[PDB]
Structures are given as structure tokens and as C-alpha cells.
Design a protein around this nucleic acid. Sequence first.
DNA 1: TGTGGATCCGAG
DNA 2: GTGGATCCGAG
Lengths: 166, 166
Amino acid sequence: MLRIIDTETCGLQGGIVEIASVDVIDGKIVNPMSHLVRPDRPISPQAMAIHRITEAMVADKPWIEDVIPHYYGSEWYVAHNASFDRRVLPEMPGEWICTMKLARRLWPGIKYSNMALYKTRKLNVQTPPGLHHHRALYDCYITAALLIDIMNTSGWTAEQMADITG
Amino acid sequence: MLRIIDTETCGLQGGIVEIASVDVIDGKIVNPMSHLVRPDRPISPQAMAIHRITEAMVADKPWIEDVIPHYYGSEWYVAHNASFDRRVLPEMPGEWICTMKLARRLWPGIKYSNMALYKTRKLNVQTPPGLHHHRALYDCYITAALLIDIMNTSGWTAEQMADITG
DNA sequence: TGTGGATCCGAG
DNA sequence: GTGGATCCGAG
Ligand code: NA
Ligand code: NA
Ligand code: NA
Ligand code: NA
């Protein structure tokens, strides 16, 4: 089982306003999870412009400390540009896999953003009703759909994608 | 006064075989100096392919230590990619202006070799009789013409230029 | 055959 | 506030 993690934040420096994962078993996506989170800092305007999550939405939510345990249960954590989420999240009990690094080894000379790959690779996932891009669970599905494409194409195991990831 | 310095070396790591310089005063090029130099090391064939200066040509020439002192006594020093000449030469007694950096700043999206600039700017200068690109005294005239044009176009001051260079 | 330096990229 | 990849100048 590979668990894709995505996160929304107050800015590039961190503070968590949302977290989500989907799990990947037998090349299928299952077991969606997502939580709005009460951050440790103001939500930057430039951040708010992106994910559209307001102070009002998170003010009654638990802290990242409180919420993270729900995401335990996985040897492997997959994140697009995993280095970000790795930094801004608290220490996870798995090992990491970055779908950005992998897509660059897999398909050199292309464009390497979550949404760029998804279009380029002409992919189609059953997306969650009612969330736009750069939300939380949405991008997980995009990233997962992209993880599947990547495994199918290369046949890479978990532990191979971990090592490549570095 | 601005002194344009150029150098032909044994390679990218150093080892002078030619120094040369010209001075810019009121947009005119004056006081040419040039010396074939005996390098502290073999002229790699890679470098020699460029400047076409043979071992024979420099066998009975002075060391760079007997010859640099002719080039001291200026407040400013101009070289194209100053950070090369600066590195391969003895500590020079002034302030440095790099025309490569000024060009990148003045004209973005362009190519930035001493000869690319010259052609792009369609500059015309009187180059010493029977020398050649990578001939030393030859590129000093080219770079002086570049400096001159940069100065016409930006109205930058010697001090402004150094600051830019960094 | 190396340096370095800029200069874009990814993540929000 | 930044770390990872490239590309480009000088001989
Ligand atoms: Na993300
Ligand atoms: Na996102
Ligand atoms: Na030079
Ligand atoms: Na030269």
C-alpha cells in the first residue's frame, strides 16, 4: 500500500491549514482521508489566493499535532515534490517517495508540476465531488493517478521509488 | 580612466601566456600595452587551439611576476567576465568592472560572449594589424568598444558599474 | 572539464 | 524562504 499525502499551508515556509491522503492498492485508489487543520500562524494572503481557505474555516479545527496520527499506518508516503510536505509536516513514520523526482527520471525534458504531468500524461481520475484544484483531497487524486501511471510505466516497486527519491 | 584587461591562458584553470590592456578616456581607446608571458605550466592543446600561442612563442618570455607590474596603477579594471582574469592573475590593485555582467543587465535574452555582444551591437573598432580573436590585444579593443557602448547606452558611472558587477 | 555564477523550476 | 537542475562565460 502506497499512501499519497497532500497538504495546504499558510505559505511556503509552512503552517498547515489542510491535510489529505489517498491510498493506492493493486493499482486502485481507495480510502480517502482529509482534514481541515488549525495552523500555527496567520494564513498569508498569497497563500489564501491559492487554496482559498480562510481563517474562518480553520479557527475551530484541531492542531496539526492532533490531526496527524490519523495518517499513520503506512510504510510509504508519496507526495508531489515530497520535499515540501516532508518539511512542513511533522515527522512521519514511513519512508518518502516524490512523484516529481520520478517523473523527471521517467520522462526527461517535460514539465513537472502536478497538473502539468496530469495533462501531458492525458490522465483521468474519478475526482471528489465539490473540491477545486489546490484544495487537499483533490490534488491527492491527481497525484495518485500520476503515481499509478508511473508504476505501470516503469514497474518500479515501492522500495525502488524510495531509493530514487533519494 | 578605465583599464581594459585581457589574458590568454594555458586553460580554464590558469597559467598566463599573454596579458594585454587598453585604457578608456572620454570614450577613446588609448595607451595599448601587451606582453607575451611564459606560463607556470604547459599550454594545454585545448587552450592553444583557441589563442594559437605555441610553447616556442613564449619559451624566452618573462614570467607573469616580472610583467604584471606594468599593468598596476589604475583605479578601475575592466575585463569580460572579470571573475576569470581576476582569478588567473595576481591580486590587482583596484576595483573591477565586468562587462559580461553589465551586458546581462542591460540587454536581457541575448548572448553574452565578448564576440556575440560585439556583433549584436554591430560595433566597429580598429583592431591591431595582423592579430585575431583570442589574440589578446585584439579582444582588449573589442571589450573596450563594448564598455564604451554600454556606457553610452546606460549612462552608468564607473562606480555604478563596479557596484553592479558586485 | 573545471569552477563558478545566475536562472528557472517545484511546493503553498 | 529555498534546495535541486541546467546553462553559460572565460582559456
Ligand atoms: Na502539495
Ligand atoms: Na494542493
Ligand atoms: Na578573456
Ligand atoms: Na581574449
